[PDB]
Design a binder for this molecule. Structure first.
Ligand SMILES: CC1CCN(C(=O)NCCc2ccccc2F)CC1
Ligand SMILES: CC1CCN(C(=O)NCCc2ccccc2F)CC1
Lengths: 193, 193
C-alpha cells in the first residue's frame, strides 16, 4: 500500500535522472514499481501527480531541516550562521537534482507545482526577514533596505543560482563555488552600510 | 516586405500582452498583420520563430544600450554607475514585458531561445566582471570572490528578480522597489570587505 506507493515514487525519481517527465510513461513507472498500469492509477491520477508528490517531499525535507536549525543555534559567527542555513538548501536540493530540475520546469505547466514552490518560498523569505530583523534589533546589522524586500531578492538569487549550478547551465557558478558565492553576497548585503 | 514583417512582429507583441503564445494562432497573427496565412509562412516558419525574432530585438536593444553607456561614462559615484547600468535592463525588459515573459518561458521548449539568452547573459557577465576587475585594479573594490563568479550570481539574481517583479509573481519585490533592492546588493557585494 504505502509500499507500492513508495515504489512508484522511487521509480519516478530514478527515471527522472535519465530523462524528462515527458519521456517517461505510466507504463514505465508501473513496470519499475512491479505493478500494472490500472493499479498505478489507483495510487496516482497521472505521472504529473507523482512528480508533485516527489517535489512536496523534497521541499518539506528542506523546510524541516531549516526548522531544526532554527531550534538548534550553532555557536558561531554571523557568517557561519548564514552559511549553515543556505547549506540546508544546497544539500537538500543538490541531493535530489532530478526532482529539483523536473519540479522547477513543471512550474510552467502545473498550478499545483507553482503554488507549492510559492508557498514554501514565501515561508523561507518570511524567516529570512525575521532573522535580518533580529540582527538589526541586536545592533549587528544596519537598517538599510526593507528587510522583507532584501530577503525576497536574496532568496530569488539563491533559487536561480543554485539550480543553474546543479544543472550545469551556461552561465552558472561551478557547484563547488556556489555556496561561498551566495554566502558572500548574503553577508555583505545584510551587514554592509 | 520589411513592412509585412514588422506588422507581423507588432501584432505578435500586441497579442502576447493578452495571452500566451500557445493561445495565439498563425491565423491570429496573419489577420492582425492584414495578410493571408500562406503569406505569413513566407516571412516566418512558425509563431515560435516570430517570438524568437521579437526576443532577439529586445535583447539586442538592451545590449546596444549597455554598449552606449560603456562608451559614455556618467560623472558620478560608483553606486550611480551600477544603478545606471542595472537600469538599462530594468527599462528595456520592463518596456517589453510580454516579450520578456513569453521569451523567458520559451527557454524550456526552444533551443534557439535558450541559446540566445545564454549568449547574451555570458556577454553581460563578462562585462560585469571586467568592470569589477577595473574597480579592484583602481583600489576602489577589495579582492574578495573571483570576479567572474560574483558577476555570474549577481546577473542571475537580476534575471530572476526583475522578471518576477514584472510578472507580479508571489513572491516578488514590488516593481517600484526592485531597482533600489538590486543596486544595494550589487554595491555591498562588490565593495564590501
Ligand atoms: C528554491 C529556493 C532554494 C534556495 N533558497 C535559499 O537558499 N534560501 C535561503 C534561506 C535561508 C538561509 C539562511 C537563513 C535563513 C534562510 F531562510 C530558497 C528557495
Ligand atoms: C536577463 C537578465 C536581465 C538582468 N541582467 C542584469 O541586470 N544585468 C546587469 C548588468 C550590468 C549592470 C551594471 C553594469 C554592467 C552590467 F553588465 C542580466 C540579464
Amino acid at each position: 500500500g504505502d509500499d507500492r506507493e513508495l515504489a512508484i515514487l522511487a521509480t519516478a525519481e530514478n527515471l527522472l535522472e535519465d530523462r524528462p517527465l515527458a519521456d517517461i510513461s505510466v507504463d514505465d513507472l508501473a513496470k519499475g514499481a512491479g505493478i500494472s498500469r490500472p493499479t498505478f492509477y489507483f495510487y496516482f491520477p497521472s505521472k504529473e501527480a507523482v512528480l508533485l508528490t516527489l517535489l512536496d517531499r523534497v521541499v518539506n525535507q528542506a523546510d524541516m531541516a531549516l526548522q531544526t536549525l532554527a531550534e538548534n543555534p550553532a555557536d558561531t559567527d554571523r557568517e557561519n550562521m548564514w552559511r549553515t542555513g543556505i547549506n540546508v538548501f544546497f544539500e537538500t536540493f543538490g541531493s535530489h537534482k532530478a526532482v529539483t530540475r523536473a519540479g522547477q520546469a513543471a512550474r510552467a505547466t502545473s498550478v499545483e507545482v507553482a503554488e507549492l514552490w510559492s508557498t514554501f518560498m514565501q515561508k523561507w523569505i518570511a524567516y529570512t526577514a525575521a532573522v535580518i530583523d533580529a540582527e538589526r534589533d541586536r545592533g549587528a546589522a544596519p537598517r538599510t533596505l526593507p528587510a522583507h524586500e532584501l530577503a525576497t531578492a536574496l532568496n530569488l538569487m539563491n533559487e536561480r543560482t543554485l539550480f543553474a549550478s546543479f544543472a550545469g547551465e551556461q552561465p552558472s557558478v561551478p557547484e563547488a563555488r556556489v555556496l561561498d558565492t551566495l554566502v558572500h553576497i548574503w553577508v555583505t548585503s545584510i551587514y554592509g552600510e
